Write a protein that binds this ligand. Structure first.
Ligand SMILES: [Fe+3]
Ligand SMILES: [Fe+3]
Ligand SMILES: [Fe+3]
Ligand SMILES: [Fe+3]
Ligand SMILES: [Hg+2]
Ligand SMILES: [Hg+2]
Ligand SMILES: [Hg+2]
Ligand SMILES: [Hg+2]
Ligand SMILES: [Hg+2]
Ligand SMILES: [Hg+2]
Ligand SMILES: [Hg+2]
Ligand SMILES: [Hg+2]
Ligand SMILES: [Hg+2]
Ligand SMILES: [Hg+2]
Ligand SMILES: [Hg+2]
Lengths: 339, 339
């Protein structure tokens, strides 16, 4: 099945990104796809430490905020914390067992590691703005609106992990387990990986960017500036993360890496399109919870729905999907200052 | 049955280190065991970029070494590369799916990430001292003596991963899989995890230190200074890695974590002892291959064997095991200069 060191001498430049021979030697002198080595290098060059960021005035700014604005700020922060709690562990548990080229294996571990720094930075902000961090952290697990917004993220990863385990343990075929038939299909597993990767692309390229707009709207008012510095560093990493999944996805659909993946991508076009639209819809719906007690200068439900549509169109076009929304200019040009 | 975001609001201070509820929120404001938070902080404080190290003179030094010394140097470097290729991926694929406290989850992902930096450093050295790095990397996979020295490392992680997949898919019990009766015992899986940790302790605390001694024998000669700087950085990280497994193991033994793990540590102590004795013998057996073309002043089979016994006793005492070897003073006190 899976092995931590395949003892067969293989040409790593000829393996597919996924489902080939597990990576044996970790070497970085050559790559099948140099984009992953470039991303590792850039991400290492961007290494930062959350505690090195001064967030000393954020507590008073937060206290002075009108209650509905405290609500907008903390709800957004809790969602960011939820997403990166998932992103810290999931690329490793879900992708590493399936990767067959070294540069992509190490990119995934570097990416996941950088997510743990993001999680540490959210703890740094939370500890410096509320008296008791535990209230904030526990609300993340059970918050109904947060889970509604992130609904389906852990399920894609979880289903891919389960199917990967069946494939590694039993291989392809029609099997039986305790009186039940269990069918294992590599094609279906490739489809699950493709859709999980598309979901991860929507997560980092759309969901987090909507959250960045919220955070930076405060920075525009010269408030929560410690948080702003941290989100700026996080967004700089996120740009690398979404670049990585865009390249994975485009290499999978072009047919240049795995012909079967190309057929899959085509067969999955409609499903993928609607999943992206569903993610956008979940982000829009979050607006009713976010602005339940009123809006803020530079940020309201309508400007956010417009930004969600703007960014979704850009991201979908980048991975070859049709645009679901009417084309428009960036509704919040000021955000470019921060990204 | 594994999930990337467990939906139950649990008190993370009361979960066992392993086999409890998978970690949902990644928070760092509190810890069941602060030693793992301190290790994360120390490892982040040591962050280093391999490519920045000047290895421009190592090529001149290496090409001018007598052939047998080239053999000693490169055989040692190839073994280091093998071990960290395994260490880069294995803590994430084998341990991460079993961790139930956030500070340990993030420590494992940071530890694994730091190992990919070690691998990157071996590529930096190799590509700058030989003309065809591929011959070196391919030999790591096919070299009989290198694989004999490492025998049992990958297979142990692999067996743990397989048993973990059966547990996550089927749960405890006696099952019928393709007409075969398969027993899934959580106690047996705990024993496998426990002994995997003991094996990883021997790997980083003994096997890598014997290799560091070989590398530093060249630094004592005022040669391979780029390599020397890198191995010094690697050893500083390795000290944190073995500290982490010593604490995981000693906390389990104490009975202050999962009580079943304290029972297992006592019941399995002869197996703990046996795996250290076997690893020490593999490290000694390597000397015949390492010095097949001749030895060096101050570095030969006898000296290597004395050091293996010396360091093995120190590491076994640190986790509560009886000493297999006669007591002796350090046979290579010059190594302290470098560590
Ligand atoms: Fe992130
Ligand atoms: Fe990210
Ligand atoms: Fe290492
Ligand atoms: Fe290590
Ligand atoms: Hg994914
Ligand atoms: Hg996913
Ligand atoms: Hg927002
Ligand atoms: Hg927003
Ligand atoms: Hg598609
Ligand atoms: Hg999609
Ligand atoms: Hg809209
Ligand atoms: Hg192990
Ligand atoms: Hg040695
Ligand atoms: Hg033991
Ligand atoms: Hg000896």
């Amino acid at each position: 099945a899976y092995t931590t060191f395949s003892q067969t001498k293989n040409d790593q430049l000829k393996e597919p990104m996924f489902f080939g021979q597990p990576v044996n030697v970790a070497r970085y002198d050559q790559q099948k796809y140099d984009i992953f080595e470039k991303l590792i290098e850039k991400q290492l060059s961007f290494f930062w430490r959350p505690e090195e960021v001064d967030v000393s005035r954020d507590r008073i700014d937060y206290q002075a905020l009108p209650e509905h604005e405290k609500h907008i700020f903390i709800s957004n922060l809790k969602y960011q914390t939820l997403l990166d709690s998932i992103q810290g562990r999931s690329p490793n548990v879900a992708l590493l067992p399936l990767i067959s080229i070294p540069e992509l294996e190490t990119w995934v571990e570097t990416w996941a590691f950088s997510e743990t720094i993001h999680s540490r930075s959210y703890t740094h902000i939370i500890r410096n703005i509320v008296n008791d961090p535990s209230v904030v952290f526990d609300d993340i697990v059970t918050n109904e609106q947060i889970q509604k917004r992130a609904e389906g993220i852990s399920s894609y990863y979880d289903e891919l992990i389960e199917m990967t385990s069946y494939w590694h343990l039993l291989g392809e075929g029609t099997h039986t387990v305790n009186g039940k038939t269990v069918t294992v299909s590599l094609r279906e597993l490739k489809k699950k990986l493709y859709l999980c990767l598309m979901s991860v692309n929507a997560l980092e390229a759309i969901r987090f960017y909507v959250s960045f707009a919220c955070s930076f709207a405060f920075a525009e008012r010269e408030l929560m500036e410690g948080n702003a510095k941290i989100i700026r560093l996080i967004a700089r990493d996120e740009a690398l993360h979404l670049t990585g999944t865009q390249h994975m996805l485009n290499l999978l659909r072009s047919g240049a890496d795995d012909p079967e993946m190309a057929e899959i991508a085509e067969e999955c076009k409609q499903e993928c399109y609607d999943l992206f639209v569903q993610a956008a819809q979940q982000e829009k719906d979050w607006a009713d919870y976010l602005f339940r007690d009123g809006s803020m200068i530079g940020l309201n439900k309508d400007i956010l729905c417009q930004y969600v549509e703007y960014i979704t169109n850009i991201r979908m076009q980048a991975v070859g999907l049709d645009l679901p929304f009417q084309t428009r200019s960036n509704p919040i040009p000021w955000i470019n200052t921060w990204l």
